[PDB]
Design a protein around this ligand. Structure first.
Ligand code: SF4
Lengths: 202, 461, 83, 117, 61
């Protein structure tokens, strides 16, 4: 309903990205610390990175995704190798209609707890990933929108909202969609937030 | 034996008896006689709130009167020494002659600060000078001031005793070769009255230093194990667990820094603590006490936390009539647990004494040293010897509460690094001192009996 | 009777101010050791009369004193928690 | 009953992925602590499909409580007076969650005073 | 001499001591020093005023 979902979805995406970056050795594990508050009450003791640039990067990415939410039906954090640009792992977070605009926060955090526990149990079984040139990426699947075409009028900015809209419309590039192995996980079945989880390997 | 063999040996032969769950074992009753009587001495008016000089004068006068009474009781006229008679002197300039003499006066030591405390207060001031220069530009001697000068307390009896500046004593010595006074015996204030030890009975659980934070997840599992152990789920010996009548959290329930903190994470920790309280209250009574790093006043006489700061699920316990099961109490308090008057302090007095470095007592942060400090605090009849560090403006008017007027049976100083007990005999009386360690690290729980005053510990890993 | 946001914010502000005041008092008491060579009482009393207008700790000290001697409406039995 | 408990543990371990404690069995089945430990051990048996990490704690003499981590070098096995299963963890990091519990009739020890409303 | 040599603001004993010698000296009013020097008790106050003027005389060198 855009009233409280925008905070709970932000917390869920924060914990999701932080868990994926931690359990896959995308960043040194010493820069992570188990916490419950990262400007928002987290549903668990989630390992959140404390790097000044990475925190701002993740926050801007999550805000951009939440702004585009009304047209996005899928969000993936792709794990690409650095010796060659190839997706070795892909964690898809489906958004099928999201039961969006057309509630006992404890239940929402319980559902998020179940989903994050499923994600952690899945990640703890994968082989250890070496550091030193392992990295990640971010890909979304939209319904109907065209990004990068808002700078065709010189768009003299007036405030921070318009500047943010411009820099969020210009921060995305177009892309395209063997031995794939799909593994489904537990999602969030709470009323307003109907989320599904997936995973891809090999 | 392997882990599976232990399980096969223990769980297969489970008794599953006496667990009726319909007629549960009633916990032993332990009452607080100081709940409704009158005159909580440490309860101040925060709205009422240098004023330290009146407290200094009152302490000086009272302690001088008490020490003079003790001296006239012990050094009564006619008490001759080995060779000659012992004389009485009023001022410190009258002790001059080849004859014994005793006088009353305060103690003056150096008491310099530690380097870490100086670094902290310098980094948190924005303009603090090089405070180390004040200690290096200027040493090791104990002196006796009695409003008329000072003399050097030389000898050997004076060295083997811990002292803090401001304390008065009854030095009895002899001038030998200069303006330096020897020491032969020392007098302390006259012994205070003590309630008679009462003559079925239970124990109390002493916990301190929970330090519920939003970063350490281990401090919640120990708290959950403690919750399950007091309810009789882990030990399963309901014949002995039902003897723990009350629980006493002695401070430091949440760990945070008020330099950088908001209402959100503090509320998270307080809701965790409130969950613990709501889950443990239907089985045992709780007495919560403020600490040094809790949301309460930084001074020593800290008022109870609030009726707020807890979840709305505890609104039935804070209605006023339910105080025997949950009682938010002042930071210093004398619980009258079935006649056993126990004086409990969160532990800021000793922690403020130990932040100094006295270049004396040579003739280091050990458990015996802190026990000696607590024994001396009980001997001097002053709970807070370092008033400018622990006390606050207006602690009282003409009747200071920290000046002990009655000795307790058990003296508890919590939030200490180590654990240790010691019974001391002061003027025919007996006080049992207990040093409660923090529960965050080395999560031990002290079980203090009330029939014989024997403290046992319970470790949780 | 039940209020955990605004009352707790007031407590945070008051405790921060009290800790700042105690830190300033400790700094002044350590600075006054140059003359008194004492650490107990009457050292805070001698240091409380320092009016050195060439020190930034003095202006902060008088500001903290003015702040602590005021705002008595918040520091009462009813701190927006009614008890 | 060994039938409702097994179903509840399987659900709370695999469908709603969360670490299940024996106190959860106490609260769900309205049973004593010893019976809950017996049921937890019985579920630890008959475990051909073992996809969890058991959390075993043991109570030594002198009133000490430890959580076994190595499961190979148990100190002072002669002083152990009890050793039961505390929880079943599907993940590696234990880190449970604690919520409000309405202990209306699952209490084995009650305080001498009653709540006055 | 300090006014001619170094260029600072106040040119007082405390300011010069802090800007040249890096020493922060407390400053007591003329009435506080009088009340300390007339205290029959509190040897600490007499030691305070004595060390006050002794440091003021030593810093001049
Ligand atoms: S204010 Fe400046 S001068 Fe007065 S005491 Fe504190 S530091 Fe020394």
């Amino acid at each position: 309903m855009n009233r409280w979902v925008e905070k709970w979805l932000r917390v869920y995406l924060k914990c999701y990205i932080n868990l994926i970056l931690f359990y896959r050795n995308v960043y040194p594990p010493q820069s992570f610390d188990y916490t419950t508050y990262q400007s928002f009450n987290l549903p668990q003791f989630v390992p959140i990175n404390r790097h000044p640039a990475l925190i701002d990067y993740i926050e801007e990415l999550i805000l951009d995704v939440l702004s585009k939410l009304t047209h996005v039906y899928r969000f993936s954090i792709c794990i690409i190798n650095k010796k060659n640009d190839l997706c070795i792992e892909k964690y898809v977070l489906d958004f099928s209609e999201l039961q969006h605009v057309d509630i006992t926060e404890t239940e929402v955090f319980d559902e998020f707890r179940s989903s994050l526990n499923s994600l952690i149990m899945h990640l703890e079984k994968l082989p250890k990933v070496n550091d030193d040139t392992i990295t990640f990426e971010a890909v979304i699947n939209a319904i109907e929108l065209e990004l990068g075409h808002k700078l065709d009028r010189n768009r003299r900015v007036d405030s921070l909202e318009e500047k943010a809209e411009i820099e969020r419309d210009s921060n995305w590039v177009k892309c395209q969609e063997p031995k794939i192995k799909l593994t489904s996980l537990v999602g969030s079945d709470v009323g307003p937030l109907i989320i599904h989880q997936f995973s891809e390997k090999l | 034996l392997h882990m599976d063999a232990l399980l096969t040996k223990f769980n297969e032969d489970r008794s599953l008896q006496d667990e009726n769950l319909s007629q549960p074992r009633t916990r032993v009753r332990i009452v607080d006689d100081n709940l409704y009587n009158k005159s909580n001495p440490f309860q101040l008016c925060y709205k009422k709130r240098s004023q330290y000089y009146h407290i200094y004068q009152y302490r000086l006068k009272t302690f001088r009167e008490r020490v003079l009474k003790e001296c006239d009781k012990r050094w009564d006229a006619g008490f001759t020494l080995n060779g000659q008679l012992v004389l009485k002197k009023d001022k410190v300039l009258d002790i001059q002659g080849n004859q014994p003499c005793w006088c009353v006066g305060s103690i003056y030591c150096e008491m310099k600060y530690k380097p870490n405390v100086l670094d902290e207060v310098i980094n948190d001031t924005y303009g603090a000078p090089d405070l180390t220069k004040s200690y290096t530009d200027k040493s090791d001697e104990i002196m006796l001031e009695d409003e008329s000068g000072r003399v050097l307390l030389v000898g050997d009896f004076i060295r083997s005793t811990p002292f803090i500046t401001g304390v008065v004593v009854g030095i009895l010595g002899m001038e030998a070769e200069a303006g330096t006074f020897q020491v032969l015996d020392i007098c302390y204030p006259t012994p205070l009255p003590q309630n008679p030890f009462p003559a079925t009975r239970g124990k109390i659980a002493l916990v301190s230093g929970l330090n519920l934070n939003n970063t350490s997840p281990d401090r919640l599992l120990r708290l959950e194990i403690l919750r399950e152990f007091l309810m009789g789920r882990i030990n399963n010996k309901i014949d002995d667990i039902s003897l723990i009548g009350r629980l006493l959290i002695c401070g430091n329930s949440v760990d945070f820094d008020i330099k950088s903190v908001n209402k959100d994470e503090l509320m998270i920790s307080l809701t965790e603590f409130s969950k613990f309280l709501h889950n443990i209250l239907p089985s045992i009574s709780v007495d919560i006490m403020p600490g040094t790093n809790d949301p309460s006043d930084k001074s020593l006489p800290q008022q109870p936390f609030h009726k707020s700061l807890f979840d709305k699920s505890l609104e039935s316990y804070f209605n006023g009539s339910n105080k025997e099961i949950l009682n938010l109490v002042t930071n210093p308090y004398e619980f009258s647990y079935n006649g056993v008057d126990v004086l409990a302090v969160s532990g800021k007095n000793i922690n403020d004494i130990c932040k100094y470095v006295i270049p004396s007592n040579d003739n280091k942060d050990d458990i015996e040293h802190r026990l000696d400090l607590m024994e001396c605090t009980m001997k001097w009849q002053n709970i807070a010897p370092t008033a400018p560090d622990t006390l606050w403006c207006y602690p009282y008017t003409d009747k200071d509460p920290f000046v002990l007027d009655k000795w307790p049976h058990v003296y508890i100083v919590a939030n200490q690094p180590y654990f240790g007990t010691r019974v001391v005999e002061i003027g025919g009386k007996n006080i049992k001192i207990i040093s409660v360690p923090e529960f965050s690290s080395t999560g031990m729980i002290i079980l203090l009996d009330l029939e014989t005053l024997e403290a046992e510990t319970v470790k949780i890993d | 009777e039940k209020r955990s946001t605004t009352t707790l914010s007031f407590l945070i502000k008051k405790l921060k101010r009290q800790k700042e005041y105690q830190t300033l008092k400790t700094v002044c008491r350590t600075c006054s050791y140059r003359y008194t060579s004492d650490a107990g009482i009457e050292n805070d009393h001698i240091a409380s009369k320092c009016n050195s207008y060439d020190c930034p700790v003095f202006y902060s000290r008088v500001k903290a004193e003015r702040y602590l001697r005021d705002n008595q409406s918040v520091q009462r039995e009813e701190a927006l928690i009614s008890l | 009953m060994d039938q409702k408990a097994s179903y509840f543990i399987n659900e709370k371990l695999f469908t709603e992925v969360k670490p299940v404690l024996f106190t959860d069995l106490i609260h769900h089945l309205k049973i004593g602590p010893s019976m809950a430990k017996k049921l937890m051990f019985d579920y630890y048996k008959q475990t051909t499909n073992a996809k969890y990490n058991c959390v075993v704690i043991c109570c030594y003499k002198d009133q000490t409580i430890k959580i076994i981590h190595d499961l190979s070098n148990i100190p002072q096995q002669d002083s152990i007076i009890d050793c039961f299963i505390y929880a079943f963890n599907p993940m590696d990091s234990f880190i449970p969650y604690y919520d409000i519990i309405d202990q209306k009739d699952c209490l084995t020890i009650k305080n001498s005073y009653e709540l006055k409303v | 001499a300090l006014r001619s040599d170094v260029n600072l603001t106040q040119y007082t004993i405390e300011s010069a001591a802090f800007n040249i010698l890096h020493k922060r000296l407390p400053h007591f009013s003329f009435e506080s020093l009088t009340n300390m020097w007339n205290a029959k008790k509190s040897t600490t106050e007499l030691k305070t005023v004595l060390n006050y003027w002794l440091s003021r005389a030593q810093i001049n060198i």
